């Protein structure tokens, strides 16, 4: 599924991501925009052999099991395929664990490089929240 901007903002708020660990909804929407362009099915292989999965491009090295990332952990205790659902619940549950890990949203390199420090409020501008 390819979410619309306000549609994703609504889903993210419903699942309690809005201001989770202090990160306003626009941060989460911005991270999703640049991680996956809002596409729940996005996958991208990393040169280390891990793969990133879903709307928030959660990595198999640490967070989910894809059965092909040797020596990896599955800290969210989920198949990475679960992170490709049109329903964002598994992605949100895992993101909450990731962002609580100690480095906040810096764990998302696209958020650090493209969202951090920016007017992230723009991402929810106009949305009925
Ligand atoms: Br957009
Ligand atoms: Br919910
Ligand atoms: Br915001
Ligand atoms: Br594996
Ligand atoms: Br959803
Ligand atoms: Br959730
Ligand atoms: Br933080
Ligand atoms: Br909305
Ligand atoms: Cl929930
Ligand atoms: Na893994
Ligand atoms: Pt939902
Ligand atoms: Pt939820």
From Swiss-Prot:
> Which E.C. number(s) belong to this protein?
3.2.1.17
Question: What are the catalytic residues?
Answer: 35, 52
Function text: Lysozymes have primarily a bacteriolytic function; those in tissues and body fluids are associated with the monocyte-macrophage system and enhance the activity of immunoagents. Has bacteriolytic activity against M.luteus.
SS bonds (residue pairs): 6-127, 30-115, 64-80, 76-94
Task: Tell me the name of the encoding gene.
Answer: LYZ
For this protein, the record's InterPro entries field holds: Glyco_hydro_22, Glyco_hydro_22_CS, Glyco_hydro_22_lys, Lysozyme-like_dom_sf
Q: Which residues cross the membrane?
A: none
Q: What is its main location?
A: secreted
Tissue expression notes: In the egg white and polymorphonuclear leukocytes.
Keyword terms, alphabetized? Allergen, Antimicrobial, Bacteriolytic enzyme, Disulfide bond, Glycosidase, Hydrolase, Secreted, Signal
Q: Which GO terms describe its cellular component?
A: cytoplasm; endoplasmic reticulum; extracellular space
| Keyword Disulfide bond assigned | yes
Q: Which GO terms describe its biological process?
A: cell wall macromolecule catabolic process; defense response to bacterium; defense response to Gram-negative bacterium; defense response to Gram-positive bacterium; killing of cells of another organism
Subunit structure as annotated in this protein's UniProt entry: Monomer.
Report the domain of life of the source organism. Answer: Eukaryota
For this protein, what reaction is catalysed? Hydrolysis of (1->4)-beta-linkages between N-acetylmuramic acid and N-acetyl-D-glucosamine residues in a peptidoglycan and between N-acetyl-D-glucosamine residues in chitodextrins
Q: Where in the cell is it found?
A: Secreted
Q: Which residues form the C-type lysozyme domain?
A: 1-129
Sequence similarity? Belongs to the glycosyl hydrolase 22 family.
Q: What else is known?
A: Lysozyme C is capable of both hydrolysis and transglycosylation; it also shows a slight esterase activity. It acts rapidly on both peptide-substituted and unsubstituted peptidoglycan, and slowly on chitin oligosaccharides.
Please tell me the species this chain comes from: Gallus gallus
For the ligand (substrate), the binding residues are: 101
Note the SMART domains from the entry.
Answer: LYZ1
Annotated protein name in UniProt: Lysozyme C
Output one GO MF annotation.
beta-N-acetylglucosaminidase activity
């Amino acid at each position: 599924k390819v979410f619309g901007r306000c549609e994703l903002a609504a889903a993210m708020k419903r699942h309690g991501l809005d201001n989770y660990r202090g990160y306003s909804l626009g941060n989460w929407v911005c991270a999703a925009k640049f991680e996956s362009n809002f596409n729940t099915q996005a996958t991208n292989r990393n040169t280390d052999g891990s793969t990133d999965y879903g709307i928030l491009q959660i990595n198999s090295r640490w967070w989910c099991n894809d059965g092909r990332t040797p020596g990896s952990r599955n800290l969210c205790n989920i198949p990475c395929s679960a992170l490709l659902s049109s329903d964002i619940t598994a992605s949100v549950n895992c993101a909450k664990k990731i962002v609580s890990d100690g480095n906040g949203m810096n764990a998302w390199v696209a958020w650090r490089n493209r969202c951090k420090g920016t007017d992230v409020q723009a991402w929810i501008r106009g949305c009925r929240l």
